[PDB]
Amino acid sequence: LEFTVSANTNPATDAVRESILANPGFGKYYTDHMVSIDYTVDEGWHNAQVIPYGPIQLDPSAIVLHYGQEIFEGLKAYRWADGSIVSFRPEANAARLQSSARRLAIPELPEEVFIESLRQLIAVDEKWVPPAGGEESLYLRPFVIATEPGLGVRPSNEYRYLLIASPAGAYFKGGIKPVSVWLSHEYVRASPGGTGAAKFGGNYAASLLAQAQAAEMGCDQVVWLDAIERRYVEEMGGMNLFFVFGSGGSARLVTPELSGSLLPGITRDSLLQLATDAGFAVEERKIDVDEWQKKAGAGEITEVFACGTAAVITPVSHVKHHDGEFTIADGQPGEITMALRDTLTGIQRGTFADTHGWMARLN
Amino acid sequence: LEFTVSANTNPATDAVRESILANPGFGKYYTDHMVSIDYTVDEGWHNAQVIPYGPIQLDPSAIVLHYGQEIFEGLKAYRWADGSIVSFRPEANAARLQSSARRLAIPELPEEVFIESLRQLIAVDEKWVPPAGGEESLYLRPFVIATEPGLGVRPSNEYRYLLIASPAGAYFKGGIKPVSVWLSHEYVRASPGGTGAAKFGGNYAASLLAQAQAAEMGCDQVVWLDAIERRYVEEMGGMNLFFVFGSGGSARLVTPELSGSLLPGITRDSLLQLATDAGFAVEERKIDVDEWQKKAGAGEITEVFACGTAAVITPVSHVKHHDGEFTIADGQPGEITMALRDTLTGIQRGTFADTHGWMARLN
């Protein structure tokens, strides 16, 4: 599968680009080009190309516009001191896009094609990757949408894979500042036999009211409890959660297990490995509101943090729910939270040794 | 709101339009024009217009293409013998679109604008409405999508309301035909507090795998059981369900109650009323697989049918699930089922008295 290149004749001026990179925000600006791959039952994935970033055309009756058959991924590209451009565990996103595709009846995109699309876009828009050593990065958003016409409800037979990139700074408006959370009493993220394990747009549209309610209760973010017993803590928005018991080299790390409806975070997977590398004991189990509030107040649970690609790690300092409210430790970012954040971002930036071979070159 | 008209300079030739109407199928072909209304915060709904049916444009980062914030509706336009074009309970669709919008954090569209969009489209594509005297019609698909660019997860501030029409022939070409159902053991349609009560794309994409499995088990359609106890019957695909007990004028109808997570079918609402008009007793309550199989076998439940806008009423003659398999009566369309379908389609076609004022003129 080969990509053809159609250069953007009217890209952003170097001044504009530089301006963006010095103050990108998140998912606000986009690079000059994008990747496009079409899919039909008879030709499979074809017509792969790098074209100028621009409006996309869809028939008014396109499936994605009526029955929400779409999926997406999210990863980053970093610039290193040696001039190379790399990504953090690209293969993991490639494999997850496939699992998401299967759950949504979307044809899988070969992993080598996935990786290739990344190299192709970086080849033409490398100048959009922020300078080395900094905290900035180039967010990559690969996604697939159903584009076949027809108002009948069924899997689409035509799809379009798109890859766009957006300069990225801090995801949350508070940066590293800790966030307060509202445990949703009225809504659930997903339930068994659903789409909670897939990165599917439908999951997000359904969470909008629950997040507005969190803010109306005086909190920054909503946290989800299992849809069955409405007791076990699972995720903050679309981020995984970790609980630190104790501190120092003897501290214990607890995080909800992959129920089957829980999003299998790449960052989550990485942090469990990093914690073990540091000698910390890790534990994947269920944990409810009572244990959380009780042990937090007791002082056993010394920290809590959320993790995901965009924000990496976000400290959680305050909790509010239908039957209570409490603070985690002194309300400040915890030692372990910041050590692990520092360790992971260091590996991604090329500062620390990548013993697991997580960093892949894209150049 | 005033609508501007930009006539299609390249409409379908009479030869093509006529060949379409002779064999339209469903959701396969579209009329010459479509309605479009834009939304922005500072101007609310504006720029209402009737334009040529054609491809839509969206930024690659448009929210609808990433976080599935979209909703839709389905209704019809019929041609009566007196030459007028009418619609069945359009106000109900207008009110449900607003209800679906609230659940998905989308600005509500005034009922007056919704109805006017319908009149406007018919004013120009009236020639696409099938002739009177038959069961054919013009299917109307009003829908709203989030068009604002930006990869941050949150409710969009820009939307586009579209209205398209597709010729619909007689649903049951060679006589009505009953379907076999597979009760999904592995999948769930929606969860409590979820988006199960709104016509929202996400619900449909998440159901594709379950429908494929139903077919793989040798059945026509998948039927959903509640997400909590996995035992109470909810719907068949995107259609509601009814259970007929007994026969003749003393027959009784039972249908799952609106648990708040069930789709408030308009056809469903109408049938309960018509059942009352005919003298049938009606019930809105829970009914599980055990009761269904036990009473269907004992000959107490004599019929089962599904209902929705497209097909109106579809008979269900065979059931298969994880713990059993059984047939309903003689496996043929039931008396009450056909009587109620004849009555409703009769009102919609203008053959029977519309004592409830359900039919609205669009002309």
Residues B4 and B151 placed together within one structural domain of the fold? yes
Q: How many CB atoms lie within 10 A of CB A331?
A: 11
Tell me the C-alpha distance between B306 and B239, whole Å.
Answer: 6
Tell me the C-alpha distance between A178 and B275, whole Å.
Answer: 58
Tell me the C-alpha distance between A352 and A346, whole Å.
Answer: 5
Tell me the C-alpha distance between A233 and A183, whole Å.
Answer: 8
Residue of A26, A28, A208 lying closest to B155 (CB–CB) = A208
Residues B121 and B162 placed together within one structural domain of the fold? yes
Give the count of Cβ contacts less than 8 A between chain A and B. 195
Residue B92 backbone phi and psi in degrees, to 5: -65, -40
Residues B139 and B11 placed together within one structural domain of the fold? yes
Place of tokens 């089957």: A260
**CATH number of the domain that residue B86 is part of:** 3.30.470.10
Q: How many domains does chain B have?
A: 2
Domain holding B91, by residue range, is 1-172+346-363
Contact across the interface for A191 and B59, Cβ inside 8 Å? no
Residues A196 and A106 placed together within one structural domain of the fold? no
Residue A322 with chain B: CB contacts under 8 Å: none
Residues A232 and A359 placed together within one structural domain of the fold? no
Burial class (CB in 10 A: 0-12, 13-18, 19+), B14: exposed
List the structure tokens of B112: 């007056």
Would residue B105 be called left, alpha or beta, if left means φ above 0 and alpha means ψ between -120 and 50 degrees?
Answer: left
For residue B200, give how far its alpha carbon lies from the nearest alpha carbon of chain A (Å). Answer: 7
Tell me the C-alpha distance between A258 and A255, whole Å.
Answer: 9
Residues B260 and B329 placed together within one structural domain of the fold? yes
Residues B147 and B203 placed together within one structural domain of the fold? no
Residues β-bridged to residue B38: B46, B160
Residue of A61, A67, A162 lying closest to B204 (CB–CB) = A67
Residues B361 and B308 placed together within one structural domain of the fold? no
Residues B311 and B220 placed together within one structural domain of the fold? yes
Residues B147 and B218 placed together within one structural domain of the fold? no
Residues B130 and B189 placed together within one structural domain of the fold? no
Residue of B26, B162, B191 lying closest to A194 (CB–CB) = B191
Tell me the C-alpha distance between A320 and A223, whole Å.
Answer: 10
Identify each DSSP E strand in A199-343 by its residue range.
221-225, 233-236, 239-245, 252-255, 281-284, 301-308, 312-321, 324-327
Contact across the interface for B192 and A193, Cβ inside 8 Å? no
Residue of A nearest to B61 (CA): A164
Query: CA A146, A148, A153, A157: dihedral to nearest 10 degrees?
Result: -80
How does strand B33-40 pair with strand B44-52?
antiparallel
Residue A205 with chain B: CB contacts under 8 Å: 67-70, 104, 195, 200, 202
Residues B184 and B223 placed together within one structural domain of the fold? yes
Contact across the interface for A66 and B141, Cβ inside 8 Å? yes
For residue B38, give how far its alpha carbon lies from the nearest alpha carbon of chain A (Å). Answer: 15
Q: Is B309 annotated as a binding residue?
A: yes
Residue B308 with chain A: CB contacts under 8 Å: none
Place of tokens 């429908």: B211
Residues β-bridged to residue A236: A223, A239
Place of tokens 């798109």: A162
**CATH number of the domain that residue A310 is part of:** 3.20.10.10
Using DSSP's 3-state secondary structure scheme, residue A64 falls into helix
Contact across the interface for A27 and B61, Cβ inside 8 Å? yes
Of A234, A239, A242, the residue nearest A184 (C-alpha) = A234
Helix B266-277 and helix B90-103, axial crossing angle in degrees, nearest 10: 140
List the structure tokens of A329: 């430790």
Residue of A64, A206, A211 lying closest to B195 (CB–CB) = A206
